Write a protein that binds this DNA or RNA. Structure first.
Ligand SMILES: [Zn+2]
Ligand SMILES: [Zn+2]
Ligand SMILES: [Zn+2]
Ligand SMILES: [Zn+2]
Lengths: 1289, 678
RNA sequence: GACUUAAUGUCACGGUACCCAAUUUUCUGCCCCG
């Protein structure tokens, strides 16, 4: 009659539920689902403290199941005493039903006792069940029990005051996913409790019979699973910090609201979260980025004033007041508070509408009509039962993601609305010590999915069930036991960002930003699986060999939850399979407890120190012999690997690392973190890549523009082509993408290149202040290109037209219509080629391998004044103004980027560029350049523009030159105009933005229409339809040689002082005189001869030395265009090559005569891809002539003069006034082999100055006052081109 | 007129366009979402400053959202309950925001009443009858009695009459209103005036109206609910109502073509059960005329066959159906759009078949029915030589328990579940003792079984008499099976002398069968793709298909025979295979691979044998469970030697009567079944 | 000992927090009179 003291220890996190009695249990759903869990009861009021316990009936049911299995293994005997098959049926007419009803099958055997059991003598099974006892089903005193199970209390080591529920449990949302659609149907909530601190329970078992005592002590060890976790049964003899940070976050958001800058708060939130990846020193050594050129602004974000001080000092003070909770919790708490305040204040964020929410569903009870079903199962006599254990490691091959609800939305006490407000920030599932976790539910669901694919047929899981499902998947899944995995890594995750693109304007949609947290690739997790049965199946072997990676074959375990962007592909490494024989070695299994919790020792165990009874398993079938493999699992997903060759600079921005990392850089490229397994830390160097979401969107836009499906505004309940290939809110995607990684980034020196840009004001001609910006792309060159390796996966079941669509998208990426990354219109990220690896299926191989002079002769009549003298006695002025008055035509039917329209044109132009005068294009990254600054300190010297030692011209220079010419031709508005301070000469009238007319202001918004320049070249709300590439050097001489000079190149220029607009506007009348252009002349000869004069006699801080190129060099570049009308293409081809004797100006030194270039149009190709075949034409001379004629008629129609006839004749552009002035400004005098060359030079400021050279009366003292010339004749002389300035006219 | 009133009037225009019966559902689902976008924008702008009219419009939009969600499977979906709950919570704010007009208070109580009626129909424990009674009395106190202009007042009045309160003052306005349909008038007469003659007339007009409406309508559910209430109240009119409603359902279901389908609605089975119980209670009454009693038992058999014809696929399986045979796909899409349009329109406004006596001489036909309402089972026998009908009853619970025991033991230990097979045969012999007596089934006759649901899987030909040394049923009679009586036909085409074999699997070996010369036609092959099945042309005398099978657990149109390059399904057999008129077919796949296992008492799932019968084959001989390959080879060789001999002779000769000494031979003998009636 | 179970009957190892959304559009490192 002796007692037994029993302990229960857990090895996985278990489940917890609230305690209701029996009837209050039936009033609730979570309590009815949460039977066979661990119970929680409250203590006192306030619902904050309590205690946890396991009932004795649950332990009794577990021991009864174990006794039944143990008696079934030895055919109804234990140590020589036999036993009957019990009783598990209760009549309703006599006595009540026992409060818990059995649905599963019960094991039975052939009863060989031959004596009917009664109260006098009974078998051990009838004693352990307690049939012939007293005290049945209504409780009495604790005697008259033959066997008694007491309750199991938590063995707390610090049971001093109470336990809080938030200190033991954590709430979590599970799921149920449909097999066909890939979307979830319903969800439910659990409480998961910690096992490292709170996992030991202690109880007492009372027994009054020894005949049952031997079997009971044997069967306490065979229990393997209780309350949702693996277990072992033995026999012995800071809300205040959250409140303070919440108040300070409210203060910060109110300051940002007062400065009318609320939308930056979101950015700021994630910035603070990224600060957990750095040390605390970034807030204590002030290593945050600064304003590179600031006088009052400081940084764009870190210098906003909050209550009279800046934000960085505020962050330093907040960290100095919260040092006890650590750095990581500080950054995460402040970021979460800022995001929650922003989501509260924004409210209607105008995204997807989403009525009607989502559904919880717990399994309904069996109250109506009942089922008193009793199903005996008899195994045959000579059967063999075994238990297999598979141990190994799981390795991430991509980044991974396991979703979780928001903290402060899942608190186990108080869980958390007529309108629906969905979140935009998502987190990853972590443990309590901040370690990564693969939960058991995700592994079990993935195993169920792959087993249903391998069997070929399975059921959808039903919840309220009276009869168990007998499909093959459920039979094999009722024998598999897994175990949850945790890593040995605690470093913070990365935040990955995503936007949306409006398909009409090709810009970003406001409020479409969202972000996820992802973990690193290369991590390793433990993996245990157990199977208890009669023979090991072929389908489980097929799933294991499918998940396992070897040489050649890679792993295909898609766990996790963002698989369409390729997240959560794991592989299985170092598998070992061991076997227990349970018919002969049952005692060793009981003694060793099935190696539960000691599976880490099995991965490192040799064959010699194994426990007795556990042998290695060697009949494990290979990959090429399994028939569930090769028929159902291998043809499921098909791999396409390829390599992109990019011959241009590549810039894919990061936008958070630019705000966190030091270096005051504006736009930097994208990097990753990779975990290594040789050592046990992350790799010190990071890896450059293009994200999976980017080329997923590239493929989506490329398919949807050809099929014409991006024009639809709604995609719910749709069955179009891009909703079949790429999925929607009801179906999962059939195509899965991975990243594009840089593979050749070790044969570069200085892989990142610094490129700076600025905007040029149209009136003054100099740079608009405070618009300088910088980029740091990766250095791609046409003779040293970047190579990126990528991969996607296609599902089985694709039709022929869908494979045609995907191959056409790949051919369109190869041809160059979709550039990668940012700033594609100025030549960044242009694809030069695509190579396809030879393991690709043959249908894609043949479908990709199957889809493989102009002169103008217009001569302009030049100005008469530099042609009549031909003795070169005149002096002209180097810059002149052009004035078309005020009328600008604004179109409100803007051409969209949603599709390739049939009536419009698209294609490419190849052009060549030739230099008539020397050219200066500087490489303004290196200020020290080529010439030493040790001697003559402060003297800036530069080099020519080069990427990897190859001379190039940037695309932004070409685009700005052609845009200024197109805007002057088509009477467009001023795109870039500085509305500067008040012009002097006394303080004069209103600022020079008010001097300009209202019609010539820049176009803001798409409501009031777009000018032709903004409609062709773009604006802030509308992408342009022309893209200009980088120009490469190809032929000719180089390096203008000069004799007495420290390099033989590298002329020293003169002074280049800022332009002064008070010379053109010299009164309160006499408004802004239009655009500004420069003339074509040879002043570089008088620079080159007088080198020694200007190397002395000036201060070397005011001077600049730079390399030069000679005349006669040929460059080559490309222009690409989509969705253009006929007159736009005609005016573009006219603006490129406007005829003989007309040329452009480009580069540095334009007053001194440097940089006169001439463009020849070499070829023009067009394509119409909505035709029967995507062809490429050649466009001969007649069609381009007709295009130019259409453009000329459109220009005449805009002018309004109906006197000019219509015919098939060559146009004469000098009949329109402003075209005649503009082509007078761009006429080259020295090209037609005439002996004349003009003299173009500025006046020299009240002589007794440096360069006077005669008594010429060419000073600013004489051309300045209203005695030698009044004001209006000065403006008239500046307005008419090529007019003489000495003598005046 | 502020912009709140402008946006409210635009949303009300959209909702009045969505309330129109001429609108298709695919436009309605967009119109309601646009209106809700505008109204929820106004709410997010002016959260508590909103007037009562916008709240009323939001509640109406959520009523439309509730009626546009179709149920999938056999469960009311939770989205419907969420929509009705949100509408109630929105209109409660307009109720508690007092100081409006009396007309707006009338409108708010009307919308709250119709949402509460629908939610009480769907869910009972969330919205009980006492709360609904109190809310409806409060709504009728405010003056919601205008029976001429709104039909929702008629719905409130009829539901209050059903709940038990007196409504005698409103009866004259209820009857004279021209918005009321005939079921509401019959309910009004029966529940207020207690007049049965006028109730009988209006119910007759209601059923004659039901003859032309699809089964997805609301009126079918309401009519069968009225008959269930009348039977519960112990009236004397449900007997005559049930038979007329059954006749209307039969005439409406007749219109579908050869692809046998019917729409799933939850009260179909209770209607057929109440019709069966009505005709049975008329037949057990004593009558001096015997011909009326013979006609009533024939009527019982007709009701059972009309239930067993179709098989009632669910909605998600209908939406996921594969696209082929552009005329039959067109027929299926026409059927689906007709059903969904009828479902929404109810809520927006308000060869030849053989006769049952056409059997060859010397045959006896036994029909089965399992009545779920009374919990019993009926067996109906027709004898042709005596020209007589009889019927008996039995229980079916313990039979179901022994069958589930054998199913679990088979699915674990396929050949070692033989003792449970013997126990199931003895249980069939003990629960149905009438098929061993001479009065019910005569001695030496051929018996045709037309089973109901889980009787499709029991071996009825191997039952054992409840004695000491019991005999089997196949020792005296020759048994045949049929899924329904509509699958029987005539013109047994015995034209050719051709023999064809097909074979795809190479697990159990059939090379000794393969090397015979009787398969002399060029149509015979041993690679077995599906196009090899669709190219047979000259109606062979015996076709033998030897492959594995695979069962879809929801849609029986997707169960396939595992031939080469993808197999061939039920639908592809029905569309493509032509030349099999009068052909004996021997399948090699077992029945357990072609049908899924059952987890309820009712099951309707037709294998590929029924599609082979609809194509035109005269008989399929198959295995009910997995047997060794040597037995199938022995059957095929015995069929090649003798094509005119009956199967039960071979079952008696090769060890079918050996249940006492060797249960494995008994397991291997009684597995074979003939599924075709001459 | 209670808080805190009922005993001839607990498949919750009966349920993947899952599904859709290109960090990008625009900008010549340029320039003479107090
Ligand atoms: Zn016993
Ligand atoms: Zn199942
Ligand atoms: Zn679509
Ligand atoms: Zn513009």
């Amino acid at each position: 009659d002796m007692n037994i003291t029993v302990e229960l220890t857990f090895f996985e996190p278990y489940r917890l539920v609230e305690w209701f009695d029996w009837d209050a249990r039936k009033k609730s759903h979570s309590a009815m689902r949460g039977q066979a869990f661990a119970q929680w009861t409250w203590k006192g009021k306030g619902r904050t403290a309590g205690k946890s316990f396991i009932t004795g009936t649950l332990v009794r049911s577990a021991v009864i199941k174990a006794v039944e299995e143990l008696l079934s293994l030895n055919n109804g005997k234990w140590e020589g005493v036999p036993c009957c098959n019990g009783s598990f049926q209760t009549d309703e007419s006599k006595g009540k039903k026992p409060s818990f009803l059995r649905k599963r099958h019960t094991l039975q055997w052939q009863a060989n006792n031959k004596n009917i059991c009664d109260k006098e003598e009974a078998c051990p099974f009838c004693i352990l069940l307690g049939r012939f006892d007293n005290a049945g089903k209504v409780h009495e005193r604790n005697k008259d029990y033959d066997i008694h199970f007491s309750n199991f209390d938590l063995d707390h080591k610090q049971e001093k005051n109470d336990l809080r529920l938030v200190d033991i449990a954590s709430g979590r949302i599970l799921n149920r996913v449909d097999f066909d659609t890939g979307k979830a149907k319903d969800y439910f909530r659990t409480w998961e409790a910690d096992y490292e601190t709170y996992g030991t329970y202690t109880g007492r078992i009372t027994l009054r019979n020894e005949h049952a005592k031997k079997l009971l002590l044997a069967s306490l060890g065979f229990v393997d699973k209780l309350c949702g976790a693996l277990c072992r049964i033995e026999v012995i003899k800071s809300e205040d910090h959250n409140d303070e940070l919440r108040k300070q976050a409210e203060v910060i958001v109110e300051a940002f609201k007062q400065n009318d800058k609320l939308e930056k708060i979101r950015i700021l939130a994630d910035a603070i979260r990224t600060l957990r990846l750095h040390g605390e020193g970034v807030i204590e050594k002030d290593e945050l980025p600064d304003g590179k050129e600031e006088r009052d602004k400081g940084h764009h974000l870190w210098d906003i004033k909050v209550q009279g001080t800046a934000l960085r000092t505020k962050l330093k003070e907040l960290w100095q007041s919260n040092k006890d909770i650590g750095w990581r919790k500080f950054t995460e708490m402040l970021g979460s508070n800022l995001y929650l305040i922003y989501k509260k204040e924004t409210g209607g964020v105008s995204t997807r509408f989403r009525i009607l929410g989502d559904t919880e569903y717990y399994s309904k009870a069996h109250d109506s009509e009942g089922s008193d079903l009793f199903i005996p199962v008899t195994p045959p006599e000579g059967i063999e039962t075994k238990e297999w254990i598979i141990v190994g490691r799981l390795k991430a091959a991509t980044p991974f993601y396991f979703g979780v609800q928001q903290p402060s939305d899942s608190i186990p006490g108080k869980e958390k609305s007529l309108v629906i407000n969905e979140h935009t920030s998502f987190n990853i599932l972590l443990d309590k010590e901040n370690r990564y976790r693969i939960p058991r539910s995700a592994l079990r669901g993935a195993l169920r999915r792959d087993l249903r694919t391998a069997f070929g047929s399975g059921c959808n899981v039903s919840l309220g069930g009276q009869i168990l499902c007998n499909c093959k998947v459920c039979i094999e899944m009722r024998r598999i036991t897994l175990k949850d995995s945790v890593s040995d890594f605690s470093e913070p995750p990365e935040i990955r960002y995503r936007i949306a693109k409006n398909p009409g304007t090709a810009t970003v949609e406001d409020g479409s930003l969202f972000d996820i947290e992802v973990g690193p690739e290369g991590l390793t997790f433990p993996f245990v699986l157990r199977y208890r049965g009669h023979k090991f199946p072929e389908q489980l072997s097929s799933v294991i060999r499918y998940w396992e990676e070897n040489d050649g074959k890679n792993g295909m375990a898609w766990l996790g939850g963002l698989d369409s962007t390729g997240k959560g592909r794991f592989a299985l490494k170092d598998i070992k399979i061991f076997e227990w024989d349970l018919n002969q070695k049952i005692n060793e299994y009981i003694k060793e407890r099935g190696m539960r919790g000691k599976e880490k020792e099995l991965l490192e165990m040799g064959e010699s120190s194994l426990p007795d009874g556990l042998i290695p398993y060697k009949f494990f079938e290979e990959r090429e012999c399994l028939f569930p493999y090769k028929e159902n699992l291998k043809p499921q997903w098909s791999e396409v690997q390829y390599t992109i060759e990019v011959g241009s600079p590549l810039l894919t921005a990061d936008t958070i690392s630019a705000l966190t990392e030091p270096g005051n850089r504006d736009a930097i490229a994208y990097k990753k973190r990779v975990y290594n397994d040789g050592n046990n830390a992350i790799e010190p160097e990071p890896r450059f890549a293009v994200k999976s979401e980017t080329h997923r969107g590239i493929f989506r836009t490329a398919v949807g523009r050809r099929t014409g499906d991006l024009g639809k505004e709604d995609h719910e309940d749709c069955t179009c082509d891009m909703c079949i290939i790429f999925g929607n809110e009801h179906e999962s995607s059939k195509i899965r993408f991975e990243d594009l990684e840089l593979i050749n980034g070790n044969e570069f020196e200085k892989l990142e290149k610094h490129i700076d840009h600025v905007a040029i004001d149209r009136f003054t001609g100099g740079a608009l202040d405070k618009a300088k910006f910088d980029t740091y792309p990766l250095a791609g060159s046409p003779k040293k290109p970047l190579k990126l390796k990528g991969r996607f996966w296609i599902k089985k079941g694709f039709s022929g037209d869908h494979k045609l669509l995907i191959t056409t998208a790949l051919s369109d990426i190869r041809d160059g219509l979709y550039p990668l990354g940012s700033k594609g219109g100025v030549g960044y990220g242009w694809v030069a080629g695509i190579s396809i690896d030879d393991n690709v299926p043959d249908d894609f191989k043949e479908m990709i391998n199957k889809t493989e002079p102009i002169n103008n002769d217009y001569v302009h009549p030049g100005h008469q004044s530099p042609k009549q003298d031909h003795k070169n006695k005149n002096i002209y002025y180097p810059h002149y103004f052009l004035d078309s008055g005020s009328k600008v035509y604004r179109e409100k039917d803007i051409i969209t980027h949603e599709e390739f329209t049939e009536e419009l044109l698209s294609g490419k132009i190849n052009c060549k560029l030739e230099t008539l005068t020397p050219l200066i294009i500087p490489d303004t990254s290196d200020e020290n350049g080529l010439k030493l600054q040790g001697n003559k300190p402060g003297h800036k010297n530069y080099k020519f523009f080069n990427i990897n030692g190859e001379l190039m011209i940037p695309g932004s220079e070409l685009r700005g030159m052609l845009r200024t010419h197109f805007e002057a031709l088509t009477k467009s508005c001023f795109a870039i105009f500085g509305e500067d301070s008040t012009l002097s000469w006394k303080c004069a009238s209103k600022t020079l933005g008010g001097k300009l007319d209202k019609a010539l202001h820049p176009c803001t918004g798409l409501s009031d229409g777009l000018c032709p320049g903004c409609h062709l070249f773009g604006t802030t709300d509308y992408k342009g339809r022309v893209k200009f590439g980088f120009a490469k050097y190809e032929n000719g001489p180089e390096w203008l040689i000069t004799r007495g000079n420290n390099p033989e190149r590298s002329l020293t220029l003169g002074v280049l002082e800022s332009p002064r607009p008070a010379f053109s506007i010299p009164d309160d009348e006499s408004e802004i005189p239009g655009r500004k252009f420069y003339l074509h002349h040879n002043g570089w000869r008088i620079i080159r001869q007088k080198q020694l004069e200007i190397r002395e006699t000036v201060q070397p801080e005011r001077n600049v030395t730079t390399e030069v190129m000679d005349k006669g060099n040929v460059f080559s570049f490309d222009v690409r265009f989509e969705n253009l009308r006929e007159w736009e293409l005609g005016l573009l081809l006219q603006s490129l090559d406007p005829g003989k004797n007309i040329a452009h100006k480009l580069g540095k030194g334009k007053p001194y005569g440097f940089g006169s270039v001439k463009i020849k149009i070499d070829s023009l190709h067009t394509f119409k891809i909505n035709s029967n075949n995507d062809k490429i034409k050649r466009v001969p001379q007649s069609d381009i002539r007709e295009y130019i004629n259409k453009g000329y008629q459109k220009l005449i129609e805009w002018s309004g003069n109906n006197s000019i006839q219509k015919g098939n004749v060559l146009p004469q552009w000098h009949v329109i006034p402003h075209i005649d002035k503009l082509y007078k400004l761009l006429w080259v005098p020295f090209l037609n082999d005439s002996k004349l060359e003009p003299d173009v030079r500025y006046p020299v400021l009240n002589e007794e100055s440096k360069g006077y050279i005669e008594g010429s009366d060419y000073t600013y003292k004489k051309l300045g006052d209203k005695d030698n010339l009044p004001y209006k004749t000065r403006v008239k002389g500046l307005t008419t081109p090529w007019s003489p300035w000495n003598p005046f006219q | 007129p502020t912009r709140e009133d402008i946006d409210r009037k635009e949303a009300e225009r959209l909702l009045d366009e969505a309330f129109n019966p001429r609108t298709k559902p695919v436009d309605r689902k967009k119109i309601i979402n646009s209106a809700l976008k505008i109204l929820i924008g106004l709410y997010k702008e002016k959260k508590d400053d909103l007037t009562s009219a916008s709240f009323i419009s939001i509640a109406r939009a959520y009523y439309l959202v509730s009626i546009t969600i179709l149920p999938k499977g056999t469960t009311i979906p939770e989205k419907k309950k969420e929509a009705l709950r949100k509408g109630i919570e929105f209109i409660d704010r307009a109720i508690n925001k007092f100081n409006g007009s009396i007309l707006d208070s009338q409108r708010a109580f009307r919308i709250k009443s119709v949402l509460s009626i629908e939610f009480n129909r769907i869910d009972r424990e969330k919205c009980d009858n006492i709360k609904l009674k109190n809310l409806l009395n409060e709504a009728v106190d405010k003056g919601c009695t205008d029976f001429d202009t709104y039909e929702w007042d008629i719905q409130i009045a009829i539901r209050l009459c059903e709940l038990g309160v007196d409504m005698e003052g409103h009866f004259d306005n209820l009857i004279k209103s021209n918005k009321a349909n005939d079921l509401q008038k019959a309910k009004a007469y029966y529940f207020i005036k207690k007049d049965d003659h006028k109730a009988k007339e209006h119910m007759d007009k209601c059923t004659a109206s039901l003859k032309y409406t699809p089964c997805s309508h609301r009126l079918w559910d309401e009519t069968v609910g009225f008959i269930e209430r009348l039977k519960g109240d112990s009236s004397t009119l449900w007997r005559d109502f049930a038979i007329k409603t059954y006749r209307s359902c039969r005439v409406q279901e007749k219109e579908t073509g050869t692809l046998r389908l019917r729409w799933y609605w939850s009260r179909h089975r209770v209607l057929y059960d109440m019709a069966f119980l009505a005709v049975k209670e008329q037949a057990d009454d004593e009558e001096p005329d015997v011909n009326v009693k013979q006609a009533k038992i024939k009527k019982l058999a007709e009701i059972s066959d009309s239930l067993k014809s179709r098989f009632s696929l669910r909605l998600s399986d209908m939406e996921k159906m594969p696209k082929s045979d552009d005329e039959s796909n067109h027929e299926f899409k026409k059927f689906l759009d007709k059903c969904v349009t009828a479902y929404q329109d109810g809520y927006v406004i308000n060869a030849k078949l053989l006769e049952l006596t056409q059997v060859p001489e010397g045959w006896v036909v036994v029909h089965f029915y399992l009545n779920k309402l009374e919990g019993m089972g009926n067996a109906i026998v027709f004898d042709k030589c005596a020209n007589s009908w009889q019927y008996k009853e039995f229980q079916y619970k313990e039979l179901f328990e022994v069958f589930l025991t054998w199913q679990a033991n088979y699915n674990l230990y396929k050949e070692n579940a033989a003792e449970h097979l013997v126990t199931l045969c003895k249980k069939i012999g003990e629960t149905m003792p009438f098929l061993f007596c001479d009065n019910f089934i005569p001695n030496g006759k051929d018996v045709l079984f037309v089973p109901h649901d889980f009787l499709h899987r029991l071996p009825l030909h191997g039952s054992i008499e409840n004695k000491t040394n019991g005999k089997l049923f196949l020792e005296n009679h020759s048994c045949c099976y049929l899924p329904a009586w509509s699958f029987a036909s005539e013109k047994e085409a015995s034209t050719s002398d051709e023999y064809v074999l097909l074979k795809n699997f190479d697990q159990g070996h059939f090379e000794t069968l393969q090397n015979n010369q009787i398969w002399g036609t060029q149509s015979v092959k041993d690679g077995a793709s599906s196009d090899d099945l669709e190219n047979i042309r000259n109606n062979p005398r015996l076709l033998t298909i030897l492959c594995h099978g695979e069962a879809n657990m929801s849609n029986p149109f997707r169960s396939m025979l595992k031939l080469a390059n993808g197999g061939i399904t039920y639908l592809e057999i029905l569309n493509s295979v032509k030349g099999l008129k009068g052909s004996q077919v021997i399948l090699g796949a077992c029945e357990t691979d072609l049908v899924p296992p059952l987890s309820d008492v009712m099951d309707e799932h037709y294998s590929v044998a029924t599609a082979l019968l609809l194509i035109g084959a005269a008989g399929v001989v198959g295995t009910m469970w997995k047997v060794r390959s040597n037995k199938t080879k022995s059957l095929i060789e015995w069929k090649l030697e003798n094509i005119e001999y009956k199967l039960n002779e071979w079952q008696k000769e090769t060890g079918g009567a050996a249940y006492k000494d060797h249960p494995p031979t008994f397991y291997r003998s009684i597995a074979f079944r003939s599924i075709g009636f001459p």
